[PDB]
Write a protein that binds this DNA or RNA. Structure first.
Ligand SMILES: Nc1ncnc2c1ncn2[C@@H]1O[C@H](COP(=O)(O)OP(=O)(O)O)[C@@H](O)[C@H]1O
Ligand SMILES: [Mg+2]
Lengths: 318, 182, 228, 228
DNA sequence: TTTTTATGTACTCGTAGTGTCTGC
DNA sequence: GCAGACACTACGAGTACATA
């Protein structure tokens, strides 16, 4: 159990240092250990559209288990002049103690980074001898295919039944360590296993919900009360939808244009239970055709705005 | 001294008849009228059927589409120009939207500072995105003293950081706003 | 703590490697490159009292360039750094030590795998020729017994084929063959004499420049070759 | 094959005419501006032993000001230009001669339509007054039986009506009346006594400056009026 | 009745700091 | 034996342009 004791947020403080310490499904835990066993790291695009799965921790865990000279940077701050300057001065020079050089680009699927992405093809080949690149992706299509040519596309697989049973209790004993290391009163777990199961894959939102209970000393309460679904449900997905608030509908588009694929996908799932069958068949046509054309979509933001205006004015909300 | 009862030439003449150019610089600034610019009035011509004849005006599909993005009745054509209007001529873009928007009579208009500095300051510190940064604060307002992490980040509030968000006059009432955090 | 002319000039040099610096109590200052390619250290004559981290070292030296030499740099009772002049007084905000990437690990250089010394006017001529000849990478090898520094145009010359400059620095004794390639960009030492220390074993290595006051340890480019 | 400092001083002058130069073996050198504006020819004290074309003559000499004057220049096996110093060596790349606009043969200046003889200090004062009176174009013509030079400010003068200078030079024994205009930007000759040869036939024309070692052919202006 | 969002590129202009050359 | 002044560079500003 690795703790960066100098950290103030539990998400960043209890980040696994080793790939073993990561609560990951089988096949993946087998894959990453195989990658670290080689001692040398090839270009890796590990990606999972589900948040809090461990994209960033695994990317850093692989850099640690291989004893890499890692330079971690967020994709948004990884512009092209940043790649020309620092990133090149890094991958060109050889580290004094040898050891693998890695450049981790977190959330590199962001849209504005398309042209700096186009710089890396040839950049990665010119310095492939001395330095590799790990890319963290939320939307894999946001990675230009020439980069996928140069990288290993690791997609976090759906955890099997055994993986769900083992990872939960691996996270349970992980929550035991952190609470006992933080000073939070357990007051019998009981709901602790239920919290892990509440947001099973999203471990980051599970730890993030331990926070907000640091001012409190208790580990137990009805946590599914205060901002439970603060992801795809309690962020104007209900209230602002129905009432057909065009003004709010348009202002609600930007905050999500970042990851279009997830949003739409979760939008077609939860909606099947809120509206009538006459609008069940109707919502699939408009949502299907908006998702069908997210490429011709120049501005994804206005594309969401068109989905909302055509969705709100045709659903017979029960 | 001044020769009292002689004619005093205007400040332009005073500055110009002197190789003191900083005062001449102040003389030219007197006609700046940059606050009296133009900006669009093409959108009004789009929804009024007026002879816009843009050519030299600043056309922005980015903007002109995003202005009609507020009005949902203009959204069918905006959805088309979003799809296929990419790589379409600026003069063609205004010309399509001419016969495409319904009726006119141009209308109204189209998340606060002291929060948006913290959101963008936490984002740069932990190297996270807006979404993640936004959530960080919201959970930190509820738990282990966000006031503490405010102090942890009082050193990296440079004027280049500050002015980047809301120039105007706030980045000086914001520069020394998060000063008092110790 | 008082900051003299030789020490502020050193800080003006260390600012080029890292936008700021972390310095703890003593007379030893040290900074490393953000990417970890150039490490600089310096024992100085001016003694500093407390531990402080400056994020904007460039702007810190610019604001100090208005106060007289009597500049009293003190800690504020809350924590900041006040600069007392003969008359005026300035307030500068200090930053957290984790904001400035600090070297933190002054592990000593190993055994010098090869040793020579470059003159002050020899470094001068190398930097002035490269300014006019656009030399971006230099390689230190052996030619006819004496070791030399060769400058190229990595962009205009892929695998460092055609030399554009060569400076001899004395003769090599042992029977070894090598070619340490250093990037001219990540080479930020100030003018002066430097006993050049070169260490490299297997696939790791570094180049250390021993100046009469400060030390500069740069990294070698991956293309470098040696038989050590 | 070393270059004396007066020869290089003449070379840094030729670089003002053309950013490059094509110099063959021998003691004779020459260049012409790309825009056919000026042409300079000169024999010098050093001896060139090999043909070489230099794409950036300005940067070549600016780099040659970084090695000692005893530097032995040569054509390296590295087929470029070798600058051997006491310790250093500069390999300045020879350029493809096709990229250097140079006179393929020395311009044989025709029989002069008018001959005068500028003095070096007279030329010196002419440049000093031009930098003070913003004199951009000058005209050499006849005034009361004597050959004189008159400068204007074509910016403010436009029609070239208001005289701003009059260097009374020699006397004219002929009967022709000419008004040859030269642009000061094309006065790329180094200071020194020159025998000024003038020629013009119809809508053509050029001026030649015969020197104690260097000659200069500078072009006349579109508005040059003559009765030759 | 309104007034702005990101990244990367190329060019011009103005001024200001720095560099190379020169006096009755 | 250096200052002056032209000469040169760098940079902030503003501009125009093409993308998503
Ligand atoms: N597989 C995992 N094993 C252990 N902890 C995890 C795992 N996935 C996420 N976490 C916890 O979530 C936090 C953030 O995870 P992160 O790498 O940011 O996931 P993502 O990048 O997909 O949001 C970490 O501090 C870590 O403690
Ligand atoms: Mg992450």
């Amino acid at each position: 159990i690795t703790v960066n004791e100098k950290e103030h947020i539990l998400e960043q403080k209890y980040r696994p240092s080793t790939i073993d310490e990561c609560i990951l499904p089988a096949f993946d835990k087998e894959t990453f250990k195989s990658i670290t066993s080689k001692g040398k790291i090839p270009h890796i695009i590990l990606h999972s559209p589900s948040p809090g799965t461990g994209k960033t921790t695994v990317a850093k865990a692989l850099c640690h288990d291989v004893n890499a000279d890692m330079m971690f940077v967020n994709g948004s701050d990884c512009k092209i002049d940043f790649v020309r300057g620092p990133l090149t001065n890094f991958a060109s020079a050889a580290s004094f103690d040898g050891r693998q050089k890695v450049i981790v680009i977190d959330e590199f699927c962001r849209s504005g980074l398309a042209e700096s992405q186009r710089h890396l093809r040839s950049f990665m080949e010119a310095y492939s001898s001395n330095c590799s690149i790990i890319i963290t992706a939320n939307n894999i299509d946001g990675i230009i295919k020439p980069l996928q040519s140069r990288c290993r596309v690791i997609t976090f697989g759906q955890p099997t039944d055994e993986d769900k049973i083992e990872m939960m209790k691996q996270m349970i004993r992980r929550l035991t360590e952190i609470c006992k290391h933080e000073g939070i009163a357990i007051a019998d777990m009981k709901v602790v296993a239920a919290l892990v199961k509440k947001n099973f894959p999203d471990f980051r939102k599970t730890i993030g919900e331990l926070d907000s209970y640091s001012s409190k000393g208790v580990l137990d309460a009805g946590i599914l009360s205060l901002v439970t679904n603060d992801r795809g449900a309690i962020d104007d997905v209900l209230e602002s939808l129905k009432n057909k608030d065009v003004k709010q509908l348009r202002a609600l588009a930007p905050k999500y244009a970042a990851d279009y694929s997830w949003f739409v996908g979760k939008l077609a799932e939860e909606i099947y239970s809120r509206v009538t069958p006459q609008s069940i068949i109707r919502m699939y046509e408009i949502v299907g055709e908006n998702n069908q054309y997210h490429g011709i979509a120049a501005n994804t933001e206005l594309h969401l705005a068109y989905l909302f205006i055509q969705l709100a004015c045709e659903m017979q909300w029960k | 001294s001044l020769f009292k009862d002689d004619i005093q030439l205007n400040e332009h003449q005073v500055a110009w008849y002197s190789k003191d150019w900083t005062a001449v610089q102040s003389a030219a600034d007197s006609f700046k009228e940059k606050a009296e610019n133009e900006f669009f009035e093409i959108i009004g011509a789009i929804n009024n059927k007026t002879k816009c004849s843009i050519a030299q005006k600043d056309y922005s599909k980015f903007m002109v589409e995003n202005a009609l993005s507020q009005f949902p009745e203009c959204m069918p054509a905006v959805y088309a120009m979003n799809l296929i209007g990419s790589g379409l001529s600026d003069e063609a873009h205004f010309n399509y939207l001419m016969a495409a928007v319904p009726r006119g009579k141009r209308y109204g208009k189209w998340e606060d500072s002291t929060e948006v500095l913290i959101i963008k300051l936490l984002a740069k510190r932990y190297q996270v995105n807006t979404n993640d940064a936004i959530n960080y604060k919201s959970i930190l307002t509820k738990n282990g003293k966000l006031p503490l992490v405010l102090k942890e980040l009082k050193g990296l509030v440079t004027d280049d950081f500050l002015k980047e968000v809301t120039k105007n006059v706030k980045e000086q009432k914001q520069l020394k706003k998060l000063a008092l955090e110790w | 703590m008082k900051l003299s002319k030789d020490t502020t000039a050193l800080l003006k040099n260390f600012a080029t490697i890292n936008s700021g610096i972390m310095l703890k109590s003593g007379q030893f200052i040290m900074t490393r490159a953000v990417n970890g390619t150039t490490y600089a250290e310096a024992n100085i004559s001016d003694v500093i009292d407390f531990d402080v981290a400056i994020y904007d070292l460039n702007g810190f030296l610019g604001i100090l360039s208005l106060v007289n030499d009597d500049a009293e740099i003190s800690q504020s009772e809350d924590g900041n750094i006040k600069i007392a002049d003969a008359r005026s007084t300035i307030f500068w905000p200090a930053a957290d030590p984790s904001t400035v990437v600090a070297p933190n690990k002054p592990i000593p250089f190993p055994v010098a795998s090869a040793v020579t010394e470059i003159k002050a006017e020899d470094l001068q001529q190398l930097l002035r020729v490269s300014r006019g000849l656009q030399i971006d990478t230099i390689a230190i090898t052996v030619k006819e017994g004496k070791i030399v520094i060769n400058g190229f145009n990595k962009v205009e010359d892929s695998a460092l084929t055609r030399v554009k400059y060569s400076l001899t620095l004395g003769d090599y004794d042992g029977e070894n063959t090598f070619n340490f390639i250093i990037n001219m960009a990540n080479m930020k030492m100030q003018p002066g004499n430097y006993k050049l220390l070169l260490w490299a074993k297997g696939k790791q290595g570094a180049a250390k420049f021993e100046g009469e006051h400060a030390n500069y340890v740069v990294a070698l480019e991956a293309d470098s070759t040696h038989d050590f």
